[PDB]
Symmetry: D3
Subunit: 71 residues, 6 copies
């Protein structure tokens, strides 16, 4: 979904994405299309921020890379 993703960053426990207001459930639904397969344990969207976590055998950086590879 084009330029709705305003920013993608991360840290020790989660990969955080910021979107235009109200776009979070939209972009987050995209990640859930791949989800577990790629190594996304889960994703939760608020209004303009998304939190997603990698599985075991995957670290946040591996997540941060595949996500880029998506958008």
């Amino acid at each position: 979904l084009k330029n709705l993703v305003l920013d993608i960053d991360y840290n020790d426990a989660v990969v955080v994405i910021h979107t235009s207001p109200g776009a979070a459930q939209l972009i987050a639904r995209l990640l859930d299309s791949l989800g577990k397969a790629e190594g996304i344990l889960g994703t939760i969207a608020g209004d303009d921020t998304i939190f997603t976590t990698p599985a075991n055998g995957f670290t946040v950086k591996d997540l941060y890379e595949a996500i880029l590879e998506l958008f």
Copy 2:
């Protein structure tokens, strides 16, 4: 927004209803939210995939409707 997100627009005697793709309601409802009472929009409230928008006094539902299609 994007129209591949808006799946259907329709109306009755009280509100104009917009259906969208799962998760898109809030995104699309913010567009209508840019139109004020003067345009005939009293309000707009979105759920997960449906939006209920209602006419401001002085505009009938058909009014709000043709206006929304114009907006799109």
Copy 3:
């Protein structure tokens, strides 16, 4: 997701209003979203504990109301 999540059903001239347990609105609304304009539902919107639903053309609010009752049973 028993209908014990549904606390009350009633209407007026524009919409049919349902009151559910807190946090059960979206879930109960999905059910109604399985009906469609053909059974007379123009649309359905859920908050946290309340749901507003409204009838399509040629359907009065009372018709939507009786369809919901039978939709839940």
Copy 4:
């Protein structure tokens, strides 16, 4: 403090209360205190808008003044 409420207006079907970003569910939780007692049939809130309708017998004008003589 109710500096979060921006406007209450009406029409033949509902009463709209525009709210600051996010304050919609909080302010709306206020309207659920009134119930069918004070003529409320129900209220749904979004992110910054609330729709509310009068119970049987009450008109929207009545419901409007309730929310005014209550807010």
Copy 5:
């Protein structure tokens, strides 16, 4: 309320529960009973994914075995 829960899994940061579309808030409300009496620090729900986290002194695997308890 039974089949509303599709999957429960975890990693080094949170336990994530996947549920039916729209049941996130209801199920996450079930978790909100346990409180910090258990190992829970917080639980946040979206539409179909639930992110919960362990409080100081508990591991994420603790919170996990305990949530299966609850369910």
Copy 6:
């Protein structure tokens, strides 16, 4: 104002804030005024619980103290 924010706590991954029912998005809105270079990485809000996580550089406690110097 008054009892809107019921608690702020933390663990290994995020700072958890509990609020009054439906107050989460509002409280979260304040948290989003601060970000990245100011400590915060992202803030998600459910209905009464909030999860906030530190920008990759800060300790969850750095972020925590900053949030305290508000509530």
